[PDB]
Amino acid sequence: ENGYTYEDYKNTAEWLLSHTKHRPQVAIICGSGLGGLTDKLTQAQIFDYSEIPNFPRSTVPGHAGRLVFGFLNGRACVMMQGRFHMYEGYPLWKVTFPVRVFHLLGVDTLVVTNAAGGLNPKFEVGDIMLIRDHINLPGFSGQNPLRGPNDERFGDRFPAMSDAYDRTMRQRALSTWKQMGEQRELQEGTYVMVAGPSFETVAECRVLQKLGADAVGMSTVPEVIVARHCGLRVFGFSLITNKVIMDYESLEKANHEEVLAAGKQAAQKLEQFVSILMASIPLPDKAS
Amino acid sequence: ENGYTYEDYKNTAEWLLSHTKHRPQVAIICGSGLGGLTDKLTQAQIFDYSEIPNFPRSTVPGHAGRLVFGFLNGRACVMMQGRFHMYEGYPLWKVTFPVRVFHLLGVDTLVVTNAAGGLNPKFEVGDIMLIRDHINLPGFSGQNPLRGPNDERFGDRFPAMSDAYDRTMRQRALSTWKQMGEQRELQEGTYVMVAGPSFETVAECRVLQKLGADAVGMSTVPEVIVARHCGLRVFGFSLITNKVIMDYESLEKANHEEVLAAGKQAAQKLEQFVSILMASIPLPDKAS
Amino acid sequence: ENGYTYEDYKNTAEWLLSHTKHRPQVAIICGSGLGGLTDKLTQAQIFDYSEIPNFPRSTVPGHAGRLVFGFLNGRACVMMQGRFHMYEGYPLWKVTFPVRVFHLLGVDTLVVTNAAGGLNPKFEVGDIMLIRDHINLPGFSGQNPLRGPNDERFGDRFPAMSDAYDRTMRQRALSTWKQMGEQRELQEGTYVMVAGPSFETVAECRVLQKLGADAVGMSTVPEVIVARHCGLRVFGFSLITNKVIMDYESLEKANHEEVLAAGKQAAQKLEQFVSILMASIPLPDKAS
Numbered sequence: 001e002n003g004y005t006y007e008d009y010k011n012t013a014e015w016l017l018s019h020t021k022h023r024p025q026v027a028i029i030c031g032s033g034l035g036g037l038t039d040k041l042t043q044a045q046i047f048d049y050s051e052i053p054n055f056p057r058s059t060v061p062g063h064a065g066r067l068v069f070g071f072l073n074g075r076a077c078v079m080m081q082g083r084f085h086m087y088e089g090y091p092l093w094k095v096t097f098p099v100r101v102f103h104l105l106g107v108d109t110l111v112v113t114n115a116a117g118g119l120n121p122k123f124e125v126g127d128i129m130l131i132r133d134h135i136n137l138p139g140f141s142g143q144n145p146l147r148g149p150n151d152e153r154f155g156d157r158f159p160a161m162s163d164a165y166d167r168t169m170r171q172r173a174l175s176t177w178k179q180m181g182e183q184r185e186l187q188e189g190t191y192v193m194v195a196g197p198s199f200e201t202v203a204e205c206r207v208l209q210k211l212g213a214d215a216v217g218m219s220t221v222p223e224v225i226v227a228r229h230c231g232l233r234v235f236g237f238s239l240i241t242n243k244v245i246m247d248y249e250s251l252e253k254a255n256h257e258e259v260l261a262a263g264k265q266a267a268q269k270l271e272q273f274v275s276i277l278m279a280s281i282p283l284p285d286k287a288s
Numbered sequence: 289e290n291g292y293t294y295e296d297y298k299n300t301a302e303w304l305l306s307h308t309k310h311r312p313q314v315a316i317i318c319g320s321g322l323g324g325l326t327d328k329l330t331q332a333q334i335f336d337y338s339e340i341p342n343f344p345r346s347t348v349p350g351h352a353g354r355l356v357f358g359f360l361n362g363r364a365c366v367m368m369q370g371r372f373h374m375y376e377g378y379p380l381w382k383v384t385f386p387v388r389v390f391h392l393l394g395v396d397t398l399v400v401t402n403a404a405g406g407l408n409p410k411f412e413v414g415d416i417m418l419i420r421d422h423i424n425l426p427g428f429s430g431q432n433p434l435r436g437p438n439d440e441r442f443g444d445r446f447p448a449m450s451d452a453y454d455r456t457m458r459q460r461a462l463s464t465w466k467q468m469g470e471q472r473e474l475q476e477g478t479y480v481m482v483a484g485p486s487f488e489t490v491a492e493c494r495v496l497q498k499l500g501a502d503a504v505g506m507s508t509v510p511e512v513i514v515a516r517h518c519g520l521r522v523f524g525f526s527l528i529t530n531k532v533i534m535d536y537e538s539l540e541k542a543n544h545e546e547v548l549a550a551g552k553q554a555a556q557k558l559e560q561f562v563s564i565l566m567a568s569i570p571l572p573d574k575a576s
Numbered sequence: 577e578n579g580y581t582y583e584d585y586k587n588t589a590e591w592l593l594s595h596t597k598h599r600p601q602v603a604i605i606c607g608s609g610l611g612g613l614t615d616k617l618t619q620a621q622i623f624d625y626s627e628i629p630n631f632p633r634s635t636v637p638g639h640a641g642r643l644v645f646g647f648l649n650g651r652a653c654v655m656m657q658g659r660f661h662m663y664e665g666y667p668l669w670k671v672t673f674p675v676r677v678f679h680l681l682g683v684d685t686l687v688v689t690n691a692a693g694g695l696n697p698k699f700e701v702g703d704i705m706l707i708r709d710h711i712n713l714p715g716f717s718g719q720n721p722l723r724g725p726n727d728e729r730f731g732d733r734f735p736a737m738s739d740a741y742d743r744t745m746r747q748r749a750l751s752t753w754k755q756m757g758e759q760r761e762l763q764e765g766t767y768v769m770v771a772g773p774s775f776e777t778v779a780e781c782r783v784l785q786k787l788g789a790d791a792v793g794m795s796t797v798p799e800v801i802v803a804r805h806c807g808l809r810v811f812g813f814s815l816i817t818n819k820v821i822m823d824y825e826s827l828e829k830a831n832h833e834e835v836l837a838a839g840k841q842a843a844q845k846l847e848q849f850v851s852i853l854m855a856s857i858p859l860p861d862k863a864s
């Protein structure tokens with residue numbers, strides 16, 4: 001919304017289109033440490049956020065912030081390596097800008113990935129959690145990417161989000177995990193978005209737990225919301241990079257070298273899993 | 289606050305006053321589908337938000353956004369048909385502007401109405417819920433209409449809200465429902481304001497439930513707060529237009545054609561009920 | 577962050593330094609009614625917020641808003657009498673500005689004090705609560721003082737806050753309370769920051785209770801967060817000035833004359849307690 005006008009999304013979509021032979025069907029948003037997925041593309045055309053018109057450039061990253069087009073396991077993709085977060089200063093209408101243009105490019109599905117902390121006791125670090133639902137803490141307070149006058153050309157005023165995370169895709173995902181003969185199971189739960197850049201206190205770790213959250217993070221939710229408003233099929237995963245909740249002798253506290261989640265090894269596992277699912281995402285062709 | 293200065297409220301009050309023979313004692317804010325209450329006025333003087341000076345115009349509505357003066361069942365009213373919401377972009381000091389000017393017009397009571405979703409299991413759609421209390425989610429985070437320097441000419445710095453919804457008015461309301469010989473009872477509970485324009489996920493529907501909320505909505509609370517700061521008697525109702533909370537087979541999801549709450553029929557029931565209560569609201573005359 | 581640049585904190589630190597013979601080791605932030613602690617200083621050099629460069633002046637206070645340097649029970653202090661709150665309009669990067677400059681002055685410890693309402697049933701007004709942890713409601717929604725690009729010269733991007741309130745200092749504080757032979761014990765619990773200037777409804781008083789909060793307030797948390805990001809040892813107390821949570825016959829409601837907490841008497845008790853603890857805060861000298 002604000003700051004951006006429809007023609008803005010229009011000019012950015014047309015520009016990209018006229019600058020790439022590619023026409024994407026699936027946009028993929030890589031979470032921290034899941035950018036290597038871009039290595040899995042064939043015929044990649046890399047665009048630096050900066051080159052792309054109204055596209056929000058990176059506050060610091062950049063060189064870990066690019067939009068790369070290609071083909072992944074059957075599908076025509078567009079991967080955003082290095083996503084925007086509101087903790088970096090971007091208003092939510094800049095953070096979710098990409099999604100609006102992906103819609104105008106022709107994208108019909110959005111797989112969003114992220115790194116998150118483990119709230120559910122079952123979860124072990126390294127785990128992967130299929131996002132079945134979410135709790136939008138910023139949104140309850142006004143920080144919803146849809147705020148402002150609504151463009152009925154994109155969507156409705158009051159979109160429902162109870163059915164956000166595609167049921168089929170999540171079923172097919174659970175099945176694909178099994179068909180791969182995977183040992184540690186594909187977990188599943190509610191992701192709670194929290195804004196601030198600092199990590200949580202035990203007291204905070206307990207309210208999110210009490211609220212029903214399984215993994216906590218600082219992104220995804222805004223993009224899921226504007227994806228859905230546009231009518232995109234959405235599904236995502238969370239790479240549990242850590243976990244906490246004990247005043248009673250924390251013995252640790254986290255920082256960032258912790259948010260690696262077995263680094264390469266565990267990240268590679270999501271990257272291939274995600275690539276395997278390209279086959280399981282419906283062709284626009286109708287494929288009947 | 290911000291954007292508005294006292295003389296602004298002053299000029300808007302004086303202008304309206306000098307433009308209307310009417311001097312209101314009760315301001316009524318109509319929720320979605322409760323604008324027909326304006327049909328119940330006698331000697332209506334209709335002002336388009338736009339004509340009124342510093343008055344925030346409607347982002348899209350307008351022609352469902354007007355301030356109409358008149359008499360309703362004994363009382364001298366001023367009804368706002370088409371209220372402002374923060375999900376439309378209005379900062380909370382624009383959303384609650386009317387209340388500040390109604391105070392300067394002479395208003396001493398404010399009946400606020402709204403449409404809300406049912407969180408309490410008891411509630412059936414079509415129901416009416418007497419607002420006994422509220423949970424201000426945006427306010428916990430900073431989105432409180434009172435934020436900014438405080439004008440002691442309007443009120444205190446730290447107004448108490450534990451006694452927001454007038455006890456007497458709510459008693460008289462419960463009684464009036466019974467005197468009307470009403471079948472389905474007048475429900476009563478805590479209203480939780482949530483900002484974002486999109487509707488809630490099941491996971492979100494469960495935190496609001498856990499927090500103690502009975503009906504969820506996206507307005508009222510900001511206006512109740514600035515009404516009280518001014519010293520106005522406040523009371524309101526919620527037209528339960530829908531209800532949800534089940535990951536375990538939602539089978540539905542809502543949108544907006546759902547938020548009708550038996551449309552006309554149920555809305556008419558609140559509109560007359562509200563008109564009947566004009567008799568039950570104390571005359572400034574002291575009436576002793 | 578925003579609005580302020582590093583050189584800004586730099587110029588304000590150097591200016592103060594060049595304007596005071598003093599070099600502080602402990603910054604103390606006085607809560608409502610705890611400003612008399614400034615009376616306990618020796619060799620005080622008082623600076624009006626206004627005189628100090630980029631320093632946010634007071635929205636109304638001022639004459640209850642000053643930065644006074646001196647010595648308190650062994651330590652070289654800098655006390656902020658009259659702290660900034662976001663309910664007054666200050667963006668969180670103005671509210672927490674002092675802390676950033678105190679860091680540049682040489683401060684290594686920050687004792688923050690505040691007045692709060694009692695959520696825990698045990699607490700009696702007049703009580704003092706050692707802040708062992710907190711729940712940052714504004715931060716969950718985006719209102720975190722660290723938001724914006726991160727200055728690695730001050731700290732990391734994702735600072736941990738699970739270990740915010742210094743364990744040792746809190747142990748030494750508990751001990752000092754006992755060594756003083758104090759009757760009513762030094763309480764301890766989780767402080768929940770809430771923004772809005774108005775006070776809470778019973779319904780709101782119950783969510784904070786359910787969330788695990790022991791005392792509710794409208795400050796401290798933002799400053800604790802930026803203090804920690806800088807690497808400062810932080811510890812604080814809360815003067816329980818009141819308490820509520822009963823729809824079922826509130827019988828009272830609060831306002832501000834209530835937030836006195838036995839005024840002088842109870843405030844004096846925290847002021848001396850705080851002064852006694854100067855001895856218990858480690859000299860930068862290493863003191864080995």
Ligand SMILES: Nc1nc2[nH]cnc2c(=O)[nH]1
Pocket residue numbers: 115116117118194198199200216217218241242243254259
């Ligand atoms: N807020 C938050 N975000 C995370 N991202 C990865 N781990 C965490 C965590 O523990 N907390």
Ligand SMILES: Nc1nc2[nH]cnc2c(=O)[nH]1
Pocket residue numbers: 403404405406482486487488504505506529530531542547
């Ligand atoms: N947030 C919200 N607002 C509503 N207004 C009417 N129904 C609803 C609902 O289900 N949710």
Ligand SMILES: Nc1nc2[nH]cnc2c(=O)[nH]1
Pocket residue numbers: 691692693694770774775776792793794817818819830835
């Ligand atoms: N929010 C809030 N702040 C306080 N500060 C002192 N008492 C209170 C209280 O009851 N509520």
